[PDB]
Design a protein around this ligand. Structure first.
Ligand SMILES: Nc1ncnc2c1ncn2[C@@H]1O[C@H](COP(=O)(O)OP(=O)(O)CP(=O)(O)O)[C@@H](O)[C@H]1O
Ligand SMILES: [Mg+2]
Ligand SMILES: [Mg+2]
Length: 575
């Protein structure tokens, strides 16, 4: 913030006001700023609402609740959920499935329950997830939450102001002195509320309220529209009435959404909200002038170029060149049979999928012959040994899982979980390049993502962990389910980037022929066995010895697979 303060000062041509420093403290903070990752992200291929069938689109995104969680496992995680759901809800999509990618040194119930309760409380199933246990995350639990929803392409909500005159409504829970705990009940009302507003063609644009609260929502909603905004802090319904404009402006009270609309629609927006027991008012006004004038009645609180707020100081970036794929070695993440713990908290117990998520990619259908896959994958264990390849391979194995389910990879929502970038700007680059190159190799673009840097315990950084939330397309009727069959190991014990595509081609043919397929580092895990039992199936196999980063999958079929990849009957699935 030292360099920044200067910069902010040079840009202000003067000395920052309390509110100014207060505001830019948020907007430029790495969390809302992305100073170390912005340029790395602009480099990634893109497209977070991915179309699905020219009629439906799935809005999905991943988010981390790291620091919060490290403090308040329960609240942190839950808050991350709440927030990520709004990000999706704001896209005008009805949140249909939560996914989490937990990375901890142990089974921290707080996080599991926090995630679980919230989702249940708002009625959004916690379909799938991922759980990685490593002492290496002792003081830095990586709580990544991904959410997905469905949205008719003709109901897609623009995520920004796009016309002077439009006004921004802030509704949902009230604003109080928070971050300057939220309930799913208000969140659920928020979803029902916002969704109703969408259904009525009232929401012309929107943005959820999280980091930066009212400041980030408004400044961004318009900044994204290359417009301005006159924000009236006094119009924000508060919980604590004595709050100061700056408190009202940067407050991060939860369960709050900003709705861009036409003055004429604001009324219903408020009616719809209120009848849903939420509070809201027309807080801002989208103006053509690119200024961000925060007001509290006729009191000018703050006025700055919206764009200055929007664009934080961008750190340079170093080009990273990757070397020979390492001969990865044992970096054990003691797998926990924490299936009893999830049961106790009703977590990831989402039985409403085309096929149990415990088999890899969670499949959801939006129609009889239509549906989408979703997977959250990461290879921290590998990324620890080599940031690039590990990170890259994590993307490739996600493509496998997606393929293994018969789903064609559509997009990637991803979360960068890194330590201090100023110290190790390399790992950050390696991580981003791997992803960049990974998307380029796979051809799968990046729809959106989250970045969490400075994850370190007294010097030590958390393992470079890029969680990959991969969206895939799939016809449910064409999704293979477990059945007594022969189990074959298909692929290789080791990894050679290039031949990855021949493995995919293979997964594709087999999957196409209806074969069942698992793509796991362990080939088969307790969950896989667990889940098979749910089908009343016994998995007896001579699991091939495999490398950490390998290119082998488990194919279950009657007939022996016939592909251009090593095939070996390794056992059977029966009874
Ligand atoms: N690794 C990544 N890849 C692609 N896009 C990324 C990214 N990291 C961040 N982004 C994008 O940059 C912006 C910020 O992501 P972030 O998750 O912090 O958003 P947010 O506005 O929802 C704030 P909050 O945490 O308060 O909910 C988004 O528009 C997101 O799509
Ligand atoms: Mg932000
Ligand atoms: Mg947000």
């Amino acid at each position: 913030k030292l360099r920044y303060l200067n910069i902010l000062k040079e840009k202000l041509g003067r000395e920052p006001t309390f509110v100014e420093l207060q505001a830019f403290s948020v907007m430029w903070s790495e969390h809302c700023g992305y100073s170390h990752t912005k340029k790395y992200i602009r480099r990634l291929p893109k497209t977070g609402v991915v179309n699905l069938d020219d009629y439906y689109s799935v809005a999905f995104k991943i988010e981390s609740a790291n620091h919060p969680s490290a403090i308040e496992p329960y609240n942190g995680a839950a808050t991350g959920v709440g927030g990520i759901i709004r990000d999706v809800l704001a896209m005008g999509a009805r949140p249909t499935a939560i996914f989490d990618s937990l990375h901890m040194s142990r089974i921290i119930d707080g996080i599991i329950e926090g995630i679980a309760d919230y989702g249940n409380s708002i009625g959004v199933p916690t379909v799938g997830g991922e759980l990685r246990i490593s002492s290496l995350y002792a003081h830095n639990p990586l709580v990544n939450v991904l959410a997905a929803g469905v949205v008719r392409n003709d109901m897609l909500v623009d995520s920004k102001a796009s016309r002077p005159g439009q006004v921004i409504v802030i509704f949902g829970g009230a604003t109080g002195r928070d971050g300057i705990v939220g309930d799913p009940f208000a969140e659920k009302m928020l979803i029902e509320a916002f969704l109703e507003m969408v259904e009525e063609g009232l929401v012309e644009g929107a943005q959820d309220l999280g980091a930066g609260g009212v400041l980030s929502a408004t400044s961004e909603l318009v900044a994204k529209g290359n417009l301005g905004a006159i924000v009236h802090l006094d119009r924000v319904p508060l919980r604590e009435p004595d709050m100061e404009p700056w408190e009202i402006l940067i407050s991060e009270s939860q369960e709050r959404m900003a709705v861009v609309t036409s003055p004429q629609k604001a009324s219903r927006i408020l009616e719809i909200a209120r009848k849903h027991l939420l509070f809201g008012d027309v807080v801002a006004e989208v103006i053509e002038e690119p200024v961000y004038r925060v007001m509290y009645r006729n009191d000018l609180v703050m006025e700055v170029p919206v764009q200055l707020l929007a664009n934080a100081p961008e750190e340079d970036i170093v080009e990273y060149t990757p070397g020979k794929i390492p001969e990865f070695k044992r970096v054990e993440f003691e797998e926990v049979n924490a299936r009893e713990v999830f049961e106790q908290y009703d977590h990831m117990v989402g039985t409403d999928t085309v096929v149990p998520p415990g088999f890899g990619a969670a499949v959801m259908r939006i129609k009889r012959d239509g549906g989408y896959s979703l997977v959250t994958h990461s290879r921290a264990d590998l990324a620890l040994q080599d940031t690039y390849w590990g990170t890259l391979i994590a993307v490739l194995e996600s493509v496998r899982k997606t393929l293994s389910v018969g789903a064609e990879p559509l997009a990637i929502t991803n979360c960068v979980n890194y330590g201090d970038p100023d110290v190790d700007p390399v790992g950050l680059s390696a991580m981003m390049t791997a992803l960049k190159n990974a998307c380029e190799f796979s051809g799968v673009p990046v729809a959106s993502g989250n970045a969490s840097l400075y994850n370190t315990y007294q010097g030590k950084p958390i393992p470079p962990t890029l969680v990959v939330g991969m969206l895939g397309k799939v016809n449910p009727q064409k999704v293979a389910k477990p059945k007594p069959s022969k189990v074959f190991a298909v692929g290789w014990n080791d990894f050679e980037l290039e031949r990855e595509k021949e493995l995919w081609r293979a997964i594709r043919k087999l999957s196409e022929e209806g074969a069942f397929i698992l793509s796991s580092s362990q080939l088969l895990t307790r969950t896989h066995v667990e889940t098979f039992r749910e089908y009343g199936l016994k998995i007896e196999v001579k699991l091939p010895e495999v490398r950490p980063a390998h290119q082998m999958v488990l194919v279950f079929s009657e007939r022996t697979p016939v592909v251009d990849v090593p095939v070996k009957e390794i056992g059977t699935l029966s009874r």
